[PDB]
Amino acid sequence: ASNFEEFVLVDNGGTGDVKVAPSNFANGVAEWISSNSRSQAYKVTCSVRQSSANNRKYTVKVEVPKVATGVELPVAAWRSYMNMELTIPVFATNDDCALIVKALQGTFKTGNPIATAIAANSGIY
Amino acid sequence: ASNFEEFVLVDNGGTGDVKVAPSNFANGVAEWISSNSRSQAYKVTCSVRQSSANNRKYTVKVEVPKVATGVELPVAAWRSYMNMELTIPVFATNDDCALIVKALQGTFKTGNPIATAIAANSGIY
Amino acid sequence: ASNFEEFVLVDNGGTGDVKVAPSNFANGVAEWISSNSRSQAYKVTCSVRQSSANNRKYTVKVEVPKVAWRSYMNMELTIPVFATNDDCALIVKALQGTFKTGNPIATAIAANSGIY
Amino acid sequence: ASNFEEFVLVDNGGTGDVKVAPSNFANGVAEWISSNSRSQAYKVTCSVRQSSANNRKYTVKVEVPKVATGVELPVAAWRSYMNMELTIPVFATNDDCALIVKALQGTFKTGNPIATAIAANSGIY
Amino acid sequence: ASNFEEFVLVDNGGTGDVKVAPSNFANGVAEWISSNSRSQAYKVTCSVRQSSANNRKYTVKVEVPKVATGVELPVAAWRSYMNMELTIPVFATNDDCALIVKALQGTFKTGNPIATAIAANSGIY
Amino acid sequence: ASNFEEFVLVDNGGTGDVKVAPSNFANGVAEWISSNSRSQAYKVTCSVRQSSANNRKYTVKVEVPKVAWRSYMNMELTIPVFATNDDCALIVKALQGTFKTGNPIATAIAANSGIY
Numbered sequence: 001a002s003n004f005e006e007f008v009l010v011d012n013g014g015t016g017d018v019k020v021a022p023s024n025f026a027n028g029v030a031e032w033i034s035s036n037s038r039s040q041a042y043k044v045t046c047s048v049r050q051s052s053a054n055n056r057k058y059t060v061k062v063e064v065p066k067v068a069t070g071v072e073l074p075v076a077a078w079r080s081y082m083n084m085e086l087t088i089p090v091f092a093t094n095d096d097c098a099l100i101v102k103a104l105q106g107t108f109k110t111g112n113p114i115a116t117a118i119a120a121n122s123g124i125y
Numbered sequence: 126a127s128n129f130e131e132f133v134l135v136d137n138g139g140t141g142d143v144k145v146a147p148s149n150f151a152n153g154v155a156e157w158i159s160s161n162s163r164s165q166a167y168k169v170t171c172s173v174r175q176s177s178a179n180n181r182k183y184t185v186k187v188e189v190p191k192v193a194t195g196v197e198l199p200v201a202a203w204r205s206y207m208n209m210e211l212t213i214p215v216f217a218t219n220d221d222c223a224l225i226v227k228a229l230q231g232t233f234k235t236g237n238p239i240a241t242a243i244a245a246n247s248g249i250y
Numbered sequence: 251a252s253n254f255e256e257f258v259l260v261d262n263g264g265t266g267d268v269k270v271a272p273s274n275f276a277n278g279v280a281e282w283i284s285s286n287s288r289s290q291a292y293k294v295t296c297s298v299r300q301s302s303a304n305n306r307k308y309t310v311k312v313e314v315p316k317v318a319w320r321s322y323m324n325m326e327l328t329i330p331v332f333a334t335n336d337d338c339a340l341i342v343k344a345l346q347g348t349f350k351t352g353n354p355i356a357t358a359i360a361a362n363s364g365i366y
Numbered sequence: 367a368s369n370f371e372e373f374v375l376v377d378n379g380g381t382g383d384v385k386v387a388p389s390n391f392a393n394g395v396a397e398w399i400s401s402n403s404r405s406q407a408y409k410v411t412c413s414v415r416q417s418s419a420n421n422r423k424y425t426v427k428v429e430v431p432k433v434a435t436g437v438e439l440p441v442a443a444w445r446s447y448m449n450m451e452l453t454i455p456v457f458a459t460n461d462d463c464a465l466i467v468k469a470l471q472g473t474f475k476t477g478n479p480i481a482t483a484i485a486a487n488s489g490i491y
Numbered sequence: 492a493s494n495f496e497e498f499v500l501v502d503n504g505g506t507g508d509v510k511v512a513p514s515n516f517a518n519g520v521a522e523w524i525s526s527n528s529r530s531q532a533y534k535v536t537c538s539v540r541q542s543s544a545n546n547r548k549y550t551v552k553v554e555v556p557k558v559a560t561g562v563e564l565p566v567a568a569w570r571s572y573m574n575m576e577l578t579i580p581v582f583a584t585n586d587d588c589a590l591i592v593k594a595l596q597g598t599f600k601t602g603n604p605i606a607t608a609i610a611a612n613s614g615i616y
Numbered sequence: 617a618s619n620f621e622e623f624v625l626v627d628n629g630g631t632g633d634v635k636v637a638p639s640n641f642a643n644g645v646a647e648w649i650s651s652n653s654r655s656q657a658y659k660v661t662c663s664v665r666q667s668s669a670n671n672r673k674y675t676v677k678v679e680v681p682k683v684a685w686r687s688y689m690n691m692e693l694t695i696p697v698f699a700t701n702d703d704c705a706l707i708v709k710a711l712q713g714t715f716k717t718g719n720p721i722a723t724a725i726a727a728n729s730g731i732y
Contacts, residue, residue, distance in 0.1 A: 009231040030249040048248040084209030106134040123173040123515035124155040147491035150278025153517035164331040215530040253479035253490040259472045274730030276519030280490040288581040298489040325450040347375040360464045365396040500713040521731040575691040589726045597625040604619035614664040615619040615646040
């Protein structure tokens with residue numbers, strides 16, 4: 001098998017979906033790039049290295065770009081950078097990992113605080 | 126209104142769901158804590174500060190604990206720490222933010238690489 | 251849940267009760283007051299914060315006025331990290347205890363007296 | 367004619383109430399404890415002094431212990447400390463006091479926020 | 492039970508009102524903004540502190556922006572800053588306040604001098 | 617035009633209205649007061665002046681008394697030089713907005729409360 005597949009990063013449901021594909025596997029660093037001009041593409045990198053003698057540490061970066069218009073030459077007016085470090089003890093059962101994943105999914109699920117916050121250029125209140 | 130509500134962090138659907146609640150709003154730092162012994166609770170913090178003259182920077186931390194057994198005194202055998210920094214230009218329309226959010230949701234949606242990776246104590250392949 | 255709600259600070263039965271209400275949440279610090287002038291209002295503030303990496307501190311303050319001045323209450327409740335929900339319940343009951351009408355402390359304060 | 371009597375500090379119906387009794391009054395600090403060993407006992411101390419020429423300060427402290435199970439030697443795993451300083455102006459009439467008391471009672475009556483929160487390891491929100 | 496809701500800051504009938512919503516409450520300063528980008532948004536901040544032992548200070552600030560036409564990148568050409576410090580003695584009753592409010596309202600009601608002048612780039616004469 | 621005129625500071629309907637009137641113009645600083653003792657008068661002062669070579673500053677102050685003391689309002693409105701008349705109109709509406717009855721700030725102050 002393989003998990004280094006292509007996948008949908010932005011899900012607008014069949015329409016303007018943003019599929020991102022494998023760019024290259026550098027040094028334990030997976031890279032995904034949406035099609036079209038690299039100059040204006042979403043990017044998602046991920047890599048797991050072993051930190052403490054007791055910890056693995058995933059590192060996921062995400063780059064969302066704003067398609068800049070009125071330049072003729074494709075470029076991004078700007079990009080927002082997501083950048084996270086997940087640490088997980090060696091002692092985690094595959095079952096535990098699942099949990100962890102959910103938690104993430106959770107913090108970001110639409111409707112939830114953090115999620116709604118970001119989506120409104122708003123902090124907490 | 127208010128977005129500093131209580132919410133489900135782990136969604137097992139009505140059953141063993143992990144609800145986390147507002148602990149306290151420190152210095153622009155929202156804190157959520159699952160009920161029961163703080164010694165063994167999930168924690169989610171979040172805070173937005175203005176970085177560059179052009180950037181806002183959310184910082185979300187998540188702590189998933191492993192309920193340690195055979196101690197009599199509640200404690201965690203260990204905790205996995207999620208920790209992310211999201212940066213977003215001032216120029217983002219509320220519409221843009223939405224997008225960004227999706228992207229996150231995406232990277233972590235079940236079935237997708239990153240997601241499936243973590244959930245298997247596995248890297249990329 | 252949601253705790254921030256109007257509640258009765260003084261249970262005078264059903265007539266003259268002192269209901270106190272949400273008034274400010276500045277700095278995740280809950281404030282409640284009576285429907286009076288700030289001068290003549292009952293005030294209740296309450297806030298949690300993890301002090302030691304071993305204990306949490308609830309900090310409650312209640313101000314009581316006298317009309318025709320006010321007395322201050324200031325409590326610091328330290329609760330170890332290990333307290334189960336059930337454990338805390340206990341703790342509460344205890345406060346409840348120390349202050350229930352008819353009990354030394356209660357009766358003491360109420361008579362403007364010390365312990366004899 | 368004393369007011370320094372034993373009283374139940376933890377009303378549990380009738381089955382296992384934690385009753386507390388006068389133990390010491392040295393240094394003008396009333397002390398009450400439980401029928402347990404000094405190390406495992408609940409403790410309540412109260413005291414009054416005339417701070418300003420206009421006020422009096424009742425100072426009460428309640429120590430709640432968590433009986434450590436499994437050590438043989440009676441002792442507490444940890445203790446929850448309670449500390450209150452009640453400032454009451456001289457001008458107060460007896461009724462005025464009773465009032466304060468009532469309010470005090472109210473503040474922590476079961477079902478009311480403050481009480482509720484403490485009891486669920488959560489902040490007020 | 493909040494009082495921190497969105498509200499219309501610029502009543503334009505129904506066709507193009509500038510509505511403003513809660514965005515942040517960090518540091519005890521209520522903030523409300525517009526659905527525009529952070530850079531082009533109207534902003535309203537309010538705060539209260541007990542200055543003297545006899546007074547309270549409401550501090551409100553309104554930022555009004557002039558959407559810059561023709562740059563592509565959303566941004567303000569300039570901003571009109573509004574800054575008020577409302578000192579209200581403790582002894583005030585609720586009605587007393589409402590009054591202040593009324594007066595405040597009056598001061599700037601359309602058709603009344605102060606308002607008129609600002610609105611015609613003239614001094615009072 | 618001519619702005620300096622008697623106006624209603626407090627619209628209490630039609631009975632008990634607080635009309636305020638021109639009282640002093642010392643230093644091109646407009647003053648208005650109620651028909652009461654200076655102690656018990658409503659006061660409104662207002663003055664413009666070009667601060668930065670880029671902005672103008674209207675400076676309004678309103679004093680409100682309590683009879684049987686007074687609370688002060690102090691506003692500084694900075695308006696860039698480029699504001700068209702229409703632009704300013706907007707600005708005004710905004711103040712109007714921030715303070716209209718039923719709106720957070722308004723309602724907040726009115727309840728002698730903060731934001732919750």
